[PDB]
Amino acid sequence: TCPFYKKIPGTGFTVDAFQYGVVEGCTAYFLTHFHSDHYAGLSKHFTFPVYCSEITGNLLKNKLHVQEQYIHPLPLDTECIVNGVKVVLLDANHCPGAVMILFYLPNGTVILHTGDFRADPSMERSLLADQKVHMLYLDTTYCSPEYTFPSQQEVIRFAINTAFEAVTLNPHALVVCGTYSIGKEKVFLAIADVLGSKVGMSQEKYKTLQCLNIPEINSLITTDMCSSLVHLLPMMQINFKGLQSHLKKCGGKYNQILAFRPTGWTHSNKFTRIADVIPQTKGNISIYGIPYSEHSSYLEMKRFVQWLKPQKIIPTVNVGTWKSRSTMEKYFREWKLEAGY
Ligand code: NI
Numbered sequence: 001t002c003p004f005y006k007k008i009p010g011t012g013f014t015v016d017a018f019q020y021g022v023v024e025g026c027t028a029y030f031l032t033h034f035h036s037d038h039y040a041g042l043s044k045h046f047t048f049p050v051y052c053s054e055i056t057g058n059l060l061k062n063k064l065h066v067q068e069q070y071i072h073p074l075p076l077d078t079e080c081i082v083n084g085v086k087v088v089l090l091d092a093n094h095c096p097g098a099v100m101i102l103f104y105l106p107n108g109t110v111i112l113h114t115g116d117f118r119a120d121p122s123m124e125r126s127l128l129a130d131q132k133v134h135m136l137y138l139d140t141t142y143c144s145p146e147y148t149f150p151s152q153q154e155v156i157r158f159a160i161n162t163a164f165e166a167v168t169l170n171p172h173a174l175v176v177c178g179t180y181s182i183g184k185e186k187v188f189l190a191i192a193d194v195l196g197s198k199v200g201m202s203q204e205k206y207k208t209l210q211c212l213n214i215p216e217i218n219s220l221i222t223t224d225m226c227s228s229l230v231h232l233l234p235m236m237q238i239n240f241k242g243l244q245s246h247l248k249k250c251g252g253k254y255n256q257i258l259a260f261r262p263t264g265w266t267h268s269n270k271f272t273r274i275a276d277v278i279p280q281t282k283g284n285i286s287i288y289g290i291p292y293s294e295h296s297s298y299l300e301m302k303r304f305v306q307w308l309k310p311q312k313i314i315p316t317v318n319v320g321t322w323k324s325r326s327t328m329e330k331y332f333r334e335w336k337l338e339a340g341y
Contacts, residue, residue, distance in 0.1 A: 005137065005314050008113070010105045012083055015113050015137070018042045027083050028072075032115025033098035034059040035181055042066060051082060053089060055097025058211035059182075077127060090126055092117040094294050095183030096212045102127070112308070113137040114316075118152075119296040119304035128308070136310035141295040141317045143328050147265050148298070149291040150274045156190050158274050159260060159290060163191045166258045167229070173256040175230045176246065178238035182208060183294050184262045189220055191260075192230040200228030226253075235261065240282045247285075256284045262292040302335055309341040 006017040012027030018041035023029075031052045032038060042050070044065035049072055052060065057073035060066040074080050076089050076099070086104035094116045103111045112133045167173050175195070177188040192199045199221050201209075206223050214220075222228055233246065238261050247257055258279075268277075269291055279286040296304070305313070313332050318324040 003319075005316055005319065008103055008111060010107060010109065011085055011103065013085070013103070015101065016115070018046075022048075030101055030113075031056055031060075032101065032113070033092065033094055034063075035095065035116065035183075038116070039064070046070060051087075053097045053099050055211065055213055056099075058213075059097070059208070062211055063208060088127055090123075090128070093120050093123075094118060095181070096185070096214070097182075102133075109134045111135045111137070112310075114139045116141070116294070117296060118294055119300040121303070123304065124307055133308055134311045135314065136305070136308065136312070137314045137316055138301075138305070139295060139317055140301070140315040140328055142265060142293075142298055143301060143315070143318065143331060145298045146270060149265055149269055149293050152186065152292060154274050155290055155292045156186055158277065159187060159288075160190050160194045162288065163230075163258065164194045166256075167195055170256055172254050173258055174247070174250065174254040176238070176243060176257055176259040177230065177232055178235040178259070178261045179205065179232050180235040182212070184292055185209070185212075185214070187260060187262050187290070187292055188230060188232055192220065192228075195229060197229045198222040198224075198227065199230045199232060200225040201232040205232060225250075238287065240285055240287075243285050243287075257286070259285070259287045261287060261289045263289050264293050264295065265291060302331075305332075306335050306339040309339070 002014060002017050002020040002023045006014050008015065012025060013030060014023055014026045015030045016032055016038040017023055017029060018039060028049050028051055031050055034056050042064055044067065046066055047070060050060065050070055051072045051074060054073040057071045060071055061068060074089050076091060080087050088102040089099040092098040092100045092115050098115060100115055100117060101113045110131060110133050114137065117139050163175050175191055188199050203223055206221060209217065209221055225231060238259055243257050243259055247254060266289060277288065279288045315328055
């Protein structure tokens with residue numbers, strides 16, 4: 001049964017609620033982004049209207065084979081009427097095609113559902129600026145002050161400089177980047193661009209990337225592994241065993257691997273500056289864990305909410321424990337008292 005925090009009161013609408021069977025009273029199912037915990041349950045046999053972004057709709061059609069007649073893509077930043085209710089989709093600064101949804105209820109209540117997001121001050125000048133929000137359904141993934149990480153731009157700078165140094169010292173080094181879903185494409189695209197290479201990958205991953213409307217993509221990616229010195233592999237293969245095995249396959253073209261694991265936050269964030277990050281090394285293989293996040297830090301989350309001033313907050317992440325819930329409610333009250341709403 002569908003939980004309360006996936007239902008939008010006063011509507012026929014649910015958000016990211018595909019794993020519950022037919023939800024009683026739901027006339028339209030919204031999907032915020034193409035990540036598995038959110039799309040869980042969709043397939044080619046789904047027969048209810050799905051509302052999402054163009055990019056999310058490309059992935060639904062090509063990867064999950066959802067039939068075209070049930071896919072309803074909406075443009076961003078545009079007032080649209082769905083089953084008699086005004087909605088707007090906003091960029092969520094998460095993975096490609098990820099959105100926030102603004103719902104303008106018939107009784108005058110305004111609701112913002114963030115989906116998954118990385119809050120940014122640029123959101124303070126979207127169509128959110130123009131009106132009041134009564135209820136906020138919030139991505140609270142990192143809602144605790146120990147969760148700090150750098151900007152995405154500093155992390156990319158670290159990775160570009162790292163890769164460029166290694167390969168200029170040894171032109172026979174291979175770079176490998178881990179992946180297990182969409183998002184974080186800047187990591188491997190920025191590295192390949194500094195090295196003057198395309199990024200090589202499996203047919204299944206190339207297909208996924210072809211759905212993302214990324215400009216000039218045919219210039220950046222390829223299925224010909226032999227022609228590329230930046231390879232993508234499944235995240236589970238980013239370990240000494242998996243990389244040794246991969247090095248075997250390259251036919252003595254390479255004699256060293258430098259590999260990157262983009263993670264979210266890890267406890268080495270509580271001690272180490274991005275500048276000071278070092279790899280784990282075994283022989284001719286090194287592995288860097290880099291803190292490339294597509295969710296708000298605690299400070300970024302706080303700034304957004306204190307700007308928005310919602311009347312009520314409903315968390316969508318970390319909802320399963322009482323300790324989590326009590327922690328989050330404490331921070332929301334702090335934020336409200338400090339800012340004065
Ligand atoms: Ni996500």
